[PDB]
Amino acid sequence: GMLEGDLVSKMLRAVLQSHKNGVALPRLQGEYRSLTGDWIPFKQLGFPTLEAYLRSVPAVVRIETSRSGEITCYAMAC
Amino acid sequence: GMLEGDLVSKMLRAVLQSHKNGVALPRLQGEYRSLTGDWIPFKQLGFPTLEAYLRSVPAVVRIETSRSGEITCYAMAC
Amino acid sequence: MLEGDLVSKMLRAVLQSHKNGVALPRLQGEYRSLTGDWIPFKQLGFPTLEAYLRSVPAVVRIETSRSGEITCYAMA
Amino acid sequence: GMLEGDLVSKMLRAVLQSHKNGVALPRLQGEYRSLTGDWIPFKQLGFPTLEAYLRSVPAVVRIETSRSGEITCYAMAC
Amino acid sequence: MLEGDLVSKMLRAVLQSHKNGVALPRLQGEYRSLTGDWIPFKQLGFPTLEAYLRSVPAVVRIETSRSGEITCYAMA
Amino acid sequence: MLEGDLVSKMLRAVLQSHKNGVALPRLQGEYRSLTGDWIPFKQLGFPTLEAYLRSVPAVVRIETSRSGEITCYAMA
Amino acid sequence: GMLEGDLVSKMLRAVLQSHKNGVALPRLQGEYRSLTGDWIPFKQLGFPTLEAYLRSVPAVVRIETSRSGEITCYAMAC
Amino acid sequence: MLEGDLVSKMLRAVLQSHKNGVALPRLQGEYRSLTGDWIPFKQLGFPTLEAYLRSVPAVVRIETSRSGEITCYAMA
Amino acid sequence: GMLEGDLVSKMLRAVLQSHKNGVALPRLQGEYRSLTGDWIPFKQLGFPTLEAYLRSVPAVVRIETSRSGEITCYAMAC
Amino acid sequence: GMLEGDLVSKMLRAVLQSHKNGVALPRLQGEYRSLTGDWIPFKQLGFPTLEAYLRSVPAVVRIETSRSGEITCYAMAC
Amino acid sequence: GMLEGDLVSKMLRAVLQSHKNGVALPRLQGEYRSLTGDWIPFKQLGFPTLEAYLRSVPAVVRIETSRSGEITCYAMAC
Amino acid sequence: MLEGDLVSKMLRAVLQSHKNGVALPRLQGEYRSLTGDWIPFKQLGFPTLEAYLRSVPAVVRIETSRSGEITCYAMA
Amino acid sequence: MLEGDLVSKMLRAVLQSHKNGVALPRLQGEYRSLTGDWIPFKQLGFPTLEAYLRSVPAVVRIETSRSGEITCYAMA
Amino acid sequence: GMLEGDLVSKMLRAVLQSHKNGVALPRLQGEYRSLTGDWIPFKQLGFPTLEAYLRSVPAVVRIETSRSGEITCYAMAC
Amino acid sequence: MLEGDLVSKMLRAVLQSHKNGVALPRLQGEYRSLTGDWIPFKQLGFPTLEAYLRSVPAVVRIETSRSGEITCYAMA
Amino acid sequence: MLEGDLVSKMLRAVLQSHKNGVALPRLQGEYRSLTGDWIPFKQLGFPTLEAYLRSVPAVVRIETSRSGEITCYAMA
Amino acid sequence: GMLEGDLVSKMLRAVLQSHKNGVALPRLQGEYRSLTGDWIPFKQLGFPTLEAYLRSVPAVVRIETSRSGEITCYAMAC
Amino acid sequence: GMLEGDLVSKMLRAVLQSHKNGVALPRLQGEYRSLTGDWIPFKQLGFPTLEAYLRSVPAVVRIETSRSGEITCYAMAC
Amino acid sequence: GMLEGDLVSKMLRAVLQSHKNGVALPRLQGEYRSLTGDWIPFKQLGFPTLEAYLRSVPAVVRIETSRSGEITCYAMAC
Amino acid sequence: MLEGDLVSKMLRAVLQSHKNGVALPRLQGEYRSLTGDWIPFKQLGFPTLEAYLRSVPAVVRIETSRSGEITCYAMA
Amino acid sequence: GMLEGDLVSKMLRAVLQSHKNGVALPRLQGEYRSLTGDWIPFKQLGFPTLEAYLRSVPAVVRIETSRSGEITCYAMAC
Amino acid sequence: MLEGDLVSKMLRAVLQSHKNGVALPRLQGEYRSLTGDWIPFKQLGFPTLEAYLRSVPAVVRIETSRSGEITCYAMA
Amino acid sequence: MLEGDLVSKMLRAVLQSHKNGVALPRLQGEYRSLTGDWIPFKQLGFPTLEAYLRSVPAVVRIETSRSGEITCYAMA
Amino acid sequence: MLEGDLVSKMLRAVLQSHKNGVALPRLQGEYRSLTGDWIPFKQLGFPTLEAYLRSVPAVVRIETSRSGEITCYAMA
Numbered sequence A, B, D, G, I, J, K, N, Q, R, S, U: 001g002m003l004e005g006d007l008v009s010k011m012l013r014a015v016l017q018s019h020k021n022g023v024a025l026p027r028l029q030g031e032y033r034s035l036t037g038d039w040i041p042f043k044q045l046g047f048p049t050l051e052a053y054l055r056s057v058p059a060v061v062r063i064e065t066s067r068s069g070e071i072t073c074y075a076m077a078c
Numbered sequence C, E, F, H, L, M, O, P, T, V, W, X: 001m002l003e004g005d006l007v008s009k010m011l012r013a014v015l016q017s018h019k020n021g022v023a024l025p026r027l028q029g030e031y032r033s034l035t036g037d038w039i040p041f042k043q044l045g046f047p048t049l050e051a052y053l054r055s056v057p058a059v060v061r062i063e064t065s066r067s068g069e070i071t072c073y074a075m076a
């Protein structure tokens, strides 16, 4: 019944909530596949990059950059 | 042995045939994932949207629009 | 207490008013009759009312006929 | 006084309502010209194809695809 | 009973209240005064209030002055 | 004596063989049965057989059902 | 004998000259069709929008914007 | 008497109701409680409620915590 | 019943056959409008320019260039 | 505190209000720089041309075209 | 922990190593899905075609074309 | 009775004629020898004969050598 | 034994039948008369029959008149 | 002597270091103009958006998103 | 008194000088002979002289031969 | 001695001839009357005469009326 | 000393003048190479197709289309 | 008489047949120029890269990739 | 009164004339800002790069490249 | 008698007037002094005067100094 | 053996070294063809213009602009 | 014996030198201290040092703090 | 004394060390063994080591096997 | 202790070795002579050595001659 976008959001929240210190963006597709069996379908959902998809779901994921320019993704409270 | 496109066609036919009143397009990726474990790879298959892929397989899927502009997908007889 | 939570609860109240469901073109009017205002589907992030209703499948069941007419039902 | 889009919508409704079994999309420009004297200005109205314009007016036209992949257009009730 | 039909009727009621027409920037406020809410021009599919008003020429006459100020009148 | 003229005449002959029309998926086979070869719709400049048939409305009448099945008839 | 662009210019001048307080741009295609039987072929004439075509014929049409951002078109004297 | 002026005044009234500020996700509900309707941020030309609030810095002070939670305060 | 492209082809043939010395391309839209009441819908038919549409119908129209680079259009025999 | 767009709007209003007969568009960047010390950042604000930015702020600036096709910009009352 | 690209590389190597005479490119998505349960995410990984992705991993896959123009993919030694 | 079904059956008949398989460049000729015409791979929706043959793996086994030469076999 | 080799030989046979050449629009029909089928110019990789004929200059000489009519001749 | 990019980096660091709780991205151009007299020239520096420029200077600016999807910019230590 | 009006009048004067018309490549020279300068077809908004001449059909008749040579005549 | 310097001086001479200014559509003709030729605004790098005149503000003052008519004056 | 475009023009004129009945466009690159030793550099000269380059040199080459849609190129007198 | 594409094909076959162990793609333009006096005109022939042109002529050239990702080109038998 | 382009030209001439051995292009934006307080608005003026703008004003700036490929900009005499 | 032929001859006449060549910025003025008008480089199909001069190497020799100044000479 | 780019570089150096006062860019293709028999293949080498290719080989060619905006090319010492 | 294998081994040696990990900005210097050169992250195919380190998770553990500072540890 | 000259000389020295050539994957390690550092193929302007080696054909002969393995030899 | 800080210090040491400056093409070699390796301009984020040197104006003064040759000097 759920929209593809709603299902992916729910799975991503499930991935991020396991990890108290967040997930480095380069590791995120792998950590999501570990839970779900497949990749985050960011192109399908209408985004050019995984980062652009993540920006579009701010109530699921908090983005923070590091000095190197890498993103770490945290589960947004709620 | 089968082409990616042939496999997806077969899976989509299997999804749609379960549903006597068809599947609303917004629900289709979810209903296909429920059967198959993954999403319909419409970008891979060379289409910009899921609707454009579905138009390309008329002997698998019948498209009908509603007054709202939403598509419902039916298994095409055969 | 989120906007979406309040709208969802009010929608459920409207749909439950109607045992036979509500034709989608009449939904905005029936909902305003109860709530005093429209369903804020653009604010909630959707291009159409029907697109919003697809986002709440636990609340509303949607039936579409073969002539393309849409009926909305309270989901139990 | 009317917007171009409103006038075209009204003319298209007038075309489709004559035809109880709908109008095949390949025949639609001709059948509309027969009534109106000119073509449906889908590029002007901001669409890349006639099909994309028709999708944008679901309360005027119902689209149904056939096994061949051709569209038939029906007047949407009302 | 469509949203657009109800909005159209309420707009007509507001404009008829005013023999001298209503300056377009004041229309939303006058309309809320009567109806309790705003004119839902985005929901109805328009980028601006004025774009919505152009969609209902049987309801509202629009005059624009040479300094670019807009006045709206009930259409008979 | 053009390719399109010959194909058109042969198609008419096939369709006239069938008072009840010919289901579009069966047309290529019936036509080969009579002519020894397929309808050359790509050579004639069309992406599909049905697209070719639309180019010859004086020859073939096309009916499409509400389930999307297509039947072709000789045009008088 | 005349260029398409010259004919359209002449027809547009004829439309605008009827209207002493000008024609709102949203109403212009309809008012031109009322006189001429067809639409202003702005895409053919090489413009992306009707407004861009109108800008290209300043000795035919004067553009003035209103507070809302709508254009009114006036016949340019001569 | 502009829509934006009225919304701004009503927002100020809501925020002043709350000495401790209002968490941004709760703002729409609190505002409807007072006014009878939602904050019309799309009509006013903004993609989000927060984007609208940034347009009125003389009215609302916005604080964001290091966990990304947002609190809105009446501006003196 | 006819395809838009077939109707336009037929009208164009009718225009060109009147003119024993052909029609200069700059004059063609005007001469076609004189017969038909509207313009040749080359963008609708999927071409960027009128010349590109004309190239696509060689059994209707013969193109010949002049020293200036202008095209003259002749009815192709048949 | 203010958005870039709000600041530019305010500065532009300040420029235009000095000039009772408006400012010719070709002169506007210079007249704005005279007051403010820099140029109107129309590309930053998401517009391809200065004219497109000005169209987007109709409650600040009234556009009127002249017979030559040049724009004059007036402060919109208020 | 692994990058998406590293995981896909490893899975592709596992697919190709089973097949002593290589895998025809048209059959590769199907043969990879048979092992892994999903498709090779070449668009995600930043490539327009499956062939372009495969070219980018030469130490995993050897490409050889046939007279028809079809590619066969072999596991690159190591 | 579909075109693709008939072509598939005729292809199988040709391949079965040859215990040692058929070199792909010779397939069109051998097939015409039996059927009177070519394999209609463009009509069936494929850019090449080999692309068509990939669409029918239950009918034809394809072997490609390390020098890039292709041999086609009847599939049991 | 390639498709293109067989088509080339059959084309030569058709053209040699005609001392005065063959008008290009009549070529498909004359060729079918001899061979039982059409010249497979799309299969062979060409958008048009004339484009195919340009690929075989050792087989066919093409003359075009100043009115744009095309005549094809066997090449010695 | 300095590169444009180095100068802008230095000015941005100066802006952000004043603000202990960071600067909301919507407020950043204004706060930078308050110090420097002009805007951050992100298009000149080769970026489509201000956010894309900021991502490119991670040793100057730390980005953190909020639940709404707004960015707050902090001076990166050093 | 517009540039285009003056150029048009001068062109007419040049063409009337010549009962047998003027070959288009010679027109600029003949026109300069009478007027002291060239026909300003770029200023008037045209990419070519011939494109300008098409804009004034009441002034100049243009004939093009089958070898592509152009002759210009005064229009009565 | 540059082209632009000479054109600028000649323009100034034309404008000074006219105490009441010169309507922009009449400028080319008046200028030719004095100089024997047109103002070479394309050569000088401008799409229009008015665009050229904007490049020389020390030479020409431009007034535009509210009906969009343009008058050019010698600058002191 | 000559511009590339002038040299190519001169060579093309030399090719076409040999051939009293013109040169079919499909044969032109070969016939030009026979005289000159290389191909006509139409992309270098700023054209997308050979036909577009030829259209740009009307005083060198006369284009005439045939019923099939093929161009024949003739030396333009002079 | 021959098409440009046919001539280039023939020359390329002549180049490759000299070299029993094939020609590394980086060396191919030079080795072809050594025989023919000019370069392979892959852009003219409608391809974005030399590799894309070579893929389009599989009955002339066999492509094989190496571990580094370099192509070697072999004359395809016949 | 002056056009933006004329003002920038004048400022650039003023910058370059100070420097007898010219200004290295990488240093130019900084040296111009030192005089003027802002950057050269090359995107506004319709150029993709600063170098493309500079090429467009040859009577202001002389460009000379060095062995490294860096440009030095000199004031053009006058 | 073509425009380009006449311009070429007049240019040669101007350049021959000057044994020491003519600095390119002064060429338009010197040429007008002799001919009464400017060199019509845009009409002749060139973006600049210098681009036109490159099209006539048999007429004008162009020297450019290391400071980028250009001198034009009659070609013998 | 040499890369296409290396061969062209060597030929260009050979052209430029003959000419003590350099070669005007408009004359360069002709002067290179005079030595080599063909044109500089700048599109093949991946550049949109001849000037862009020349910029890419600064140790072969020195570019200097003139007041008109024309480039002169000099052999770079070495 | 691959470059990547050698770099990986040398990196492990550097990280093992440090029980408390190594701050990422100091890693290049510490690594050069041991090896005589820098970590060749561009050669190995990565835009940044950190991007390279992500490619070797069996060798280096990366911790990032909430202020965005990065610490690298030998992986057991 | 250029970087490329020094790298070229050092590469030659490494390759000459090996009568049987050096497998390309081992080249970086062998070269570092002699020189103390890697071959700087990115600095020298190449995307890969093999792309750099193609730029110096007078120094290194490259052989590629039919399984795609690469061997590098000193060029005499 | 950053890579860029160490490279900067080593560069300064090399340049100070040379009172007369160092020609840019010789810089990499002189720097390797002192440090054992190349200047890592790609790692540091620059397309060229000269682009890197522009990033450190407090360290190196760059002079370019009118023939385009570059000399680098220690900055005091």
Ligand SMILES: [Cl-]
Pocket (backbone or CB within 6 Å): A003, A004, A005, A006
């Ligand atoms: Cl979705």
Ligand SMILES: [Cl-]
Pocket (backbone or CB within 6 Å): A022, A023, A024, A027
């Ligand atoms: Cl992590």
Ligand SMILES: [Cl-]
Pocket (backbone or CB within 6 Å): A040, A041, A042, A043, A044, A045, B043, K044
């Ligand atoms: Cl995806």
Ligand SMILES: [Cl-]
Pocket (backbone or CB within 6 Å): A048, A049, A050, A051
């Ligand atoms: Cl991504």
Ligand SMILES: [Cl-]
Pocket (backbone or CB within 6 Å): A049, A050, A051, A052
């Ligand atoms: Cl990403």
Ligand SMILES: [Cl-]
Pocket (backbone or CB within 6 Å): A056, A057, A058, A059, A060
């Ligand atoms: Cl969200």
Ligand SMILES: [Cl-]
Pocket (backbone or CB within 6 Å): A025, A026, A069, A070, A071
């Ligand atoms: Cl990242």
Ligand SMILES: [Cl-]
Pocket (backbone or CB within 6 Å): B003, B004, B005, B006
């Ligand atoms: Cl597929």
Ligand SMILES: [Cl-]
Pocket (backbone or CB within 6 Å): B022, B023, B024, B027
């Ligand atoms: Cl459903």
Ligand SMILES: [Cl-]
Pocket (backbone or CB within 6 Å): A044, B040, B041, B042, B043, B044, B045, K043
């Ligand atoms: Cl996909």
Ligand SMILES: [Cl-]
Pocket (backbone or CB within 6 Å): B048, B049, B050, B051
């Ligand atoms: Cl989609």
Ligand SMILES: [Cl-]
Pocket (backbone or CB within 6 Å): B049, B050, B051, B052
């Ligand atoms: Cl879709």
Ligand SMILES: [Cl-]
Pocket (backbone or CB within 6 Å): B056, B057, B058, B059, B060
């Ligand atoms: Cl299908």
Ligand SMILES: [Cl-]
Pocket (backbone or CB within 6 Å): B025, B026, B069, B070, B071
């Ligand atoms: Cl839908």
Ligand SMILES: [Cl-]
Pocket (backbone or CB within 6 Å): C039, C040, C041, C042, C043, C044, E043, H042
């Ligand atoms: Cl809403």
Ligand SMILES: [Cl-]
Pocket (backbone or CB within 6 Å): B068, C048, C049, C050, C051
């Ligand atoms: Cl809806």
